[model samples]
Target: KVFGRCELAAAMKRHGLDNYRGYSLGNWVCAAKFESNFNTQATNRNTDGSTDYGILQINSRWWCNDGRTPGSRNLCNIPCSALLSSDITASVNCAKKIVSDGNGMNAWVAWRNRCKGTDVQAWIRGCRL
Candidate 1:
């Protein structure tokens, strides 16, 4: 499923990403904006032979098991395909895991390049929530 910008913000807020792990709600919204544009089925392949999956684009190298990535940690204990589900519950849960882990919000290069250290609140201001 694909979400509008404010729709995604509201959803992420409901999923407990607002100020999650000290990152602002807007940051998560911004990350989602760039990472998958709020499409639940988004996927990207990395040059290092790993893959990013779902709206938050969880990585196969360490988070989800794609079965193709050798030494996959599957730390979130979910299949990469699970991240693509339209339900979004598992994907949001896995995204929570991603932030609490080492990289914090740095888990996504899109966040680093576009959202990090910026006044990301602009993304959420349009939301009713």
Candidate 2:
């Protein structure tokens, strides 16, 4: 399920990320845009052998338990496969836990490179919110 910008914005906002951790809902949208292009089943593998899963690209090495990464924290307590569901709640919750850990949006390099100091408002510019 690849979401359109406004569709993704509405979903994230409904899940209470409107101003989560000082990052606006649009900021989340912005990072996700660069991370996965809103693809619910997206997955990527890093050279370190850790994998990134889900729309938010939650990593296996530190976030989800893929049982492949050598030293996974599995902080979300959910399997990496769970993040691939179209329902997104697992992915969303895991992302929240990451931010809750005080990592902020900086946890995502995609956000750091693309949204860190840019105008994220464009991500939700025309959305109803």
* Highest TM-score against the true fold, candidate: 2
Q: Across residues 47-102, which tens digit of lDDT does each residue of candidate 2 receive?
A: 98899998999999988899899888899999999999988789888898999997
Worst lDDT 10-window in candidate 2: 17-26
Model 1: per-residue Cα lDDT over 21-69, one tens digit each = 8988899888888999899999999888999998999999999999999
TM-score for each predicted model, relative to the true structure: 0.94, 0.96
Regions more than 4 Å wrong, model 1: none
Give the per-residue Cα lDDT of candidate 1 at 58.
91
Taking all chains together, the TM-score of candidate 1 against the true structure is 0.94
Backbone-clash count (model 1): 0
- Candidate 1 lDDT: 0.88
Assess candidate 2 and give its lDDT: 0.90
Candidate 1 collision pairs: none
Clashing pairs in 2: none
Model 2, residue 16: C-alpha shift (Å) = 0.8
